[PDB]
Amino acid sequence: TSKAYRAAAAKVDRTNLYTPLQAAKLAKETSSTKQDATVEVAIRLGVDPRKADQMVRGTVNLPHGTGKTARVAVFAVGEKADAAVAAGADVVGSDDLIERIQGGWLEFDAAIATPDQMAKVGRIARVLGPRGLMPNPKTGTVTADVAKAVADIKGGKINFRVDKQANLHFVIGKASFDEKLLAENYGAAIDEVLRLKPSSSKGRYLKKITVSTTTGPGIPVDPSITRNFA
């Protein structure tokens, strides 16, 4: 307890499941009492991640963005390096960046590379292993024309990936947004998770869902009603 966490706990009921809009309504009335916040959604799936064909992994583009720094490290040499900084990449990867990441400077947020210079990716993934900032072909970060996904990672392509205990974790943007802006990222997330739903999922696929702030408690939302996120 903190004698202010119980103020927001006195305003949100625990047992009552809510609509996707009332979660975004109480996203404003719980987070914004404190400082700035990012809205957190935790989803417990109905899969078992021990098997191979139940590893739920995918990405989604968000329409209203997410409001973050997005320090994208695009890896390309030659004239392809200038295409990233013209597109909006602050630090463009090269060979000199390899000798300073291995020195202990890893201040970046993603890795969008080119298929010709992937030899340096396996050497730079020494310390990018447990960090999980590998270049992924399934999220479009490994592609030939790298002049597309630079502003897309800025645009809100947050990667969701199921853990060992079958718990998705995903952000739908900052807490300084509106109710019609938050619930559409909520609607675009779940509608693309169900496309990634494996065919061998026993039982109810979407068991329990919650929405939480950065300091306050979690909002129990109803997994049953998924049609009217607007």
Partner: protein
């Protein structure tokens, strides 16, 4: 109610020797089951079904989906590579080739077509974050510090018997199968590798089976005893002091029930030999009940046991074995340094020390199979030497248990007498047509009994026991130690069993090396109980750890 392994009406039998018959039990995860029973009961034949190495005759036995099975065999094999290469063939075996391809695709893809190999490295680099397999250089270096493995750069052909078992446990404790199948894990392990494995199997996810004859390891790693009598399986709970109660009770209520049946045969055999009187008939419905009682009285006739019997040798002189300033080693590492002792006449001497410290090399300088560095070994004119060995090198697998003791000969020499060979091996329990089993099908508890038949027929008055208390159960462990106390010569024993040197010892030769010497020994005059009180008064009063986790998960 989710399970691991289920048996349904399993019946495995090697003909007359049944192992299972109409058995059914289920294994749930988190269970800590220790399986007990006498020697030859069938304990390793159960685990060779539960690992998928053998098939039951008429039954159903299947693992649940997922949760694979790793077995420790009773004689664990290895490969002809190094130690660091001996731990990657399992535990890292399914996952190092996914790293052997990722360091290939870093260079082979850069000159070939970069469009279809994009997902070929895609579905493998995403197999290196769920397991965190980037640290495969330094996960092996943690799993060797836990078991105190040998250094990982030398071969594995010349290792101790308890050093080969440490590198075989690392092949299974890195895999982490949810159904462990440990077959006699505390063989050849010192008092540290057992105390380590008690703590590691305490907090362990998954099901653990362990066929352990010893009384104190099963009280720490098990809480649910499974038993194998003649065919049946008796699951219950307790801590192994209740197993010897119930097997003593299951034979006292079966023994006198089979004595009431014997009196009813004598009352009925007198009726079938009494003759039919005048025109009455001897009823066929009592003849047909006699010949069913007479058939159910011969099937209960399996109650016998053979004692361990050492032949006596010639008269032993005043000088048995003298060792004066012995130095012994193989490399820059020195094992034995400046040792001076002399074996007594008519006593039992115990050799005590951890694994890989120089105990089998101490015998192999005495038997004349090594050569000392400095100092000499001196025997004497009277001593005939008899030597059992740890490796069981004399017994070959593709030759029957009879014609290894003999060589197709009828009568053998057991020291100035001629006993018949089949009469000699039947004095070692191998009776009837069990004398034609080869050495590959014998159990581990009766290769520790066959090795005593090969080497005690030398009839010597100096026997060198290199771990005889290895795979023996409680009935014949007491039969061995009662044959050493009545032995007239001198017996030297290497053993790790603390409650076996405490019972039969007169002299202790124990390793006491520390950080500045690492190669010194110590001759003590007394039993094992007085050695442990002197060990805590000379070096390190009340001083003669935390569990190394083997992994970061």
């Amino acid at each position: 109610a989710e399970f691991i392994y289920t048996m349904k009406k399993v019946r495995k039998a090697h003909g007359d020797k049944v192992i299972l018959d109409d058995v059914t039990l289920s294994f749930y995860p988190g269970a800590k089951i220790g399986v007990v029973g006498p020697n030859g009961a069938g304990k390793s034949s159960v685990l060779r079904i539960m690992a998928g190495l053998d098939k039951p005759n008429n039954g159903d036995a299947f693992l649940a989906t997922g949760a694979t099975v790793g077995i420790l065999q009773q004689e664990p094999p290895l490969n002809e590579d190094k130690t660091v290469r001996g731990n990657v063939e399992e535990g890292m075996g399914d996952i190092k080739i996914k790293l052997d391809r990722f360091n290939e695709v870093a260079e082979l893809m850069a000159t070939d077509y970069t469009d279809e190999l994009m997902e070929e490295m895609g579905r493998l680099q995403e197999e290196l974050d769920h397991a965190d397999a980037w640290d495969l250089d330094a996960q092996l270096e943690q799993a060797m510090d836990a078991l105190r493995c040998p250094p990982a750069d030398e071969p594995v052909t010349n290792l101790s018997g308890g050093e080969r078992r440490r590198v075989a446990l690392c092949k299974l404790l890195l895999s982490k199968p949810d159904l462990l199948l440990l077959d006699e894990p505390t063989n050849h392990l010192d008092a540290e590798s057992v105390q380590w494995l008690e703590q590691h199997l305490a907090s362990y996810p998954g099901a653990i089976l362990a066929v352990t004859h010893d009384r104190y390891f099963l009280d720490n790693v098990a809480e649910w005893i499974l038993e194998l009598d003649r065919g049946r399986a008796y699951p219950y709970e307790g801590n192994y002091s209740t197993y010897l109660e119930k097997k003593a009770e299951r034979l006292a209520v079966q023994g006198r029930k089979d004595a009431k049946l014997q009196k009813r045969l004598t009352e009925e055999l007198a009726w079938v030999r009494s003759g039919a009187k005048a025109r009455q008939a001897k009823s066929k419905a009592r003849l047909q009940r006699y010949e069913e009682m007479a058939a159910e009285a011969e099937k209960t006739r399996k109650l016998d046991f053979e004692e361990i019997q050492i032949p006596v040798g010639p008269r032993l002189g005043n000088v048995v074995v003298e060792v004066d300033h012995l130095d012994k080693g193989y490399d820059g590492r020195a094992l034995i340094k400046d040792l001076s002792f002399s074996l007594p006449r008519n006593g039992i001497v115990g050799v005590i020390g951890p694994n890989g410290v120089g105990k089998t090399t101490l015998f192999k300088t005495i038997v004349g199979l090594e050569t000392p560095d400095s100092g000499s070994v001196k025997v004497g004119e009277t001593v005939k030497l008899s030597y059992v060995d740890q490796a069981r090198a004399g017994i070959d697998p593709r030759k029957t248990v009879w014609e290894v003791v003999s060589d197709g000969l009828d009568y053998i020499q057991v020291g100035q007498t001629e006993v018949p060979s089949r009469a000699y091996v039947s004095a070692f329990g191998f009776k009837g047509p069990d004398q034609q089993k080869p050495a590959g099908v014998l159990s581990g508890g009766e290769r520790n009994r066959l090795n005593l038949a090969l080497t005690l027929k030398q009839g010597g008055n100096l026997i060198l026991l290199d771990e005889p208390t290895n795979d023996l159960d409680v009935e014949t462990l007491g039969s061995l130690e009662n044959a050493l106390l009545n032995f007239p010569g001198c017996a030297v024993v290497i053993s790790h069993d603390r409650w076996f040197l405490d019972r039969t010892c007169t002299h202790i030769l124990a390793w006491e090396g520390d950080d500045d010497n690492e190669a010194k020994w110590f001759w003590f005059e007394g039993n094992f109980g007085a050695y442990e009180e002197n060990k805590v008064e000379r070096l390190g009063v009340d001083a003669a750890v935390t569990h190394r986790k083997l992994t970061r998960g």
